[PDB]
Amino acid sequence: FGFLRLSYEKQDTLLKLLILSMAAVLSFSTRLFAVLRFESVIHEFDPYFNYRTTRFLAEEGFYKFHNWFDDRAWYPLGRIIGGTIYPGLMITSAAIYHVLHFFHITIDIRNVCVFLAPLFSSFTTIVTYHLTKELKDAGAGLLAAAMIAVVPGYISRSVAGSYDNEGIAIFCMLLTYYMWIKAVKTGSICWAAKCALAYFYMVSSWGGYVFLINLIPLHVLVLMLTGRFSHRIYVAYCTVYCLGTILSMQISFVGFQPVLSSEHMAAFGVFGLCQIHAFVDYLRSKLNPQQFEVLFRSVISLVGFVLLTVGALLMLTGKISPWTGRFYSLLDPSYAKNNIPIIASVSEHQPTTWSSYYFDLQLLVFMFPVGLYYCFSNLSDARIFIIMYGVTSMYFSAVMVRLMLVLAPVMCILSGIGVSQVLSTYMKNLDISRPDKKSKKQQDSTYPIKNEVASGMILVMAFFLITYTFHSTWVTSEAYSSPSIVLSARGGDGSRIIFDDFREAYYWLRHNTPEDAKVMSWWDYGYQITAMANRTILVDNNTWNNTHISRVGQAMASTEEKAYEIMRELDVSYVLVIFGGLTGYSSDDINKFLWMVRIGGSTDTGKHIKENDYYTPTGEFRVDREGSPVLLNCLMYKMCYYRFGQVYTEAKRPPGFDRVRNAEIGNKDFELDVLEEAYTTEHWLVRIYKVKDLDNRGLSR
Amino acid sequence: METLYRVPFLVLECPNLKLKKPPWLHMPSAMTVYALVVVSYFLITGGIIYDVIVEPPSVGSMTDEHGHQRPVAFLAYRVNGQYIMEGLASSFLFTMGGLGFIILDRSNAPNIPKLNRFLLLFIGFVCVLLSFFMARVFMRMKLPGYLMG
């Protein structure tokens, strides 16, 4: 009876604190699997670029970082780092780092970046509970926080060591929505100002800000069509638009896109419409209805013609830029595949399958409709926005696998609402929990089993919830805990053997080559080489220049003599290629060879390169004796398979066999006229060749 | 200009035109929109968009020492690859599970006959339990090591 004597207000608050506190602990802890199993290192290719920038900003100061121009990348063109980057992620890391040192807590910058992502996941959990509470109740909010904490889809990009923009982008997005919902619901300017400020913070953090600037106009427009438009909506939306537009423009990278791009036009159009709608209502109330029709018709005819002419003129003249390639694809799926090879090339741009949805979300997929049904049943202005957020995310998540992360937040909140409704309804069905007010007479004799029905329904729901935890734990441990830079292989004895070839090659270059040497490689590895090798590179992941990449592709795909001519022009010193045949590493260059062929031929200079030439007469890509003659004599084939014919990969297979393609190389013996072997890793994962100079005697090489 | 159109109608009988808004064309009801969304959800989770871009066969083929071409429904060992038949079959299960709860909720309403209430409950549990349990089997076949440690 000790718990009973406490006031109910005490009981509710105490449980609320305990549930939220635990959820934060779980969110942070679950992301440490990689750091424990493997070394505390930066993961993936993109994060390294952020890591290098973060160090430069902290050591050099903000002002120097703002104007930083990097000459070590995209040689000889160069890149302007200050104006082509998003500063949000770097600024947050630097600011915390300064504070910790200020108190004499000396921590490495590398540690700060590695552990930045888990901490924010805990912050995201708190924001989720408040946003859900506003829509329905506290009970739903506690459910949402639990689901968001362990959702695998969010975990994939937020694991410890994943220093990527996505880690902070999600938290900013939820906060901005939470401010927006309060701004509309309360109708207060103060909330509107807070919402705009949060929006600006997101704009710096990520490049995905565009999604928000279109969804919010869409929500307002639907309310107008449905007749729910009110003074509160006018103040909240209009106030945010003005401050948000100016704030976003401050970022150097965004520049003038908000006012000149066709991407941001939707927000501008809705803003103009709101003024017209508000003014018309004010006139109607003051004026006599009979007269009002005469003025109303005359005004519409004159204004409508003027507005239509202005809009047509802007589009036709081309003052407003057409949509960017990246966004056009997201809408029209076919456009990217048929028109832009580079966008198709990326491996996270593929459409999503059913297996992907279940693997990332599991139970939530079952519960997503239930949340939708309740929201439709009880229509509210705040609720309308969440429906818009859901139904769009589903469409944009199928088109691209990467956008799954955007889907994960909406999925957790909506699924929680469905679970909350089911739990409350049946639980109060269980009279034992509450006698409350009951009438024995007219009790519905169509009912024999009240005690049993509720007990079974609650029990089954609990079973589903526990299973969700188990699935989420197993997937994260087995899927998202692998560092890309370090590869795990099993030995014959079954021991865990670690392959460190990727770093080993970088270290060799770092100390054993001239400082001014230029290294040529595929654009995939541009960030990694610069961060660790500290040597100049020709191409980078950002791929700001398509023509430069295409020229690189031509050299690799071409014959040995032609490739040499291109390389000399660019002052290439070394070439790095990754070969996985010995170890069975699937993601080698040879699999990526085809993309090189298409990209190389995309430009005018690469017209001579035809994809069909590299295939067998039957349309097959093979590296064996039956392979196309052009393929066997291309630069890439020679580099990967130089001296590889005589190596025994397997006891059960003849020498010169390639394990990953499961085929034996057709051309086993050949010599490199213009290239010499500089260094090869122990497992041959990375091979480095040095460019030979011209002939001393002038003989044709 | 109007006379020119009259010239055929001098001999021909002019059609009697009533340019009124069609009666059936009403603003969609809130329930109507929800139904439309649900069907769309079925297709999107099914990977219809994946099918259009990638154009996989409905079913593939395999072989053994006994030889001969087994049809294949599940694309083994690659999470981001699917066949046409497999994607739709999985998607339907997901929709069914959601509906099972809604029908169960409606069954709880007061003033329902004894026979009606019992029958409705049976359907609700069958849809929910089969939909969830079957989905686990489908993944287990696609990835043999699923949830195995």
Partner: peptide
């Protein structure tokens, strides 16, 4: 025979970002 060490499979490679598609042929 020459060396030992067979790699495992990356059950969840797909999430990796800014990386080239290593399955066009398949």
């Amino acid at each position: 025979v020459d060396v030992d060490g067979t790699v495992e499979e990356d059950l969840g490679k797909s999430r990796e970002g800014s990386r080239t598609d290593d399955e066009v042929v398949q």
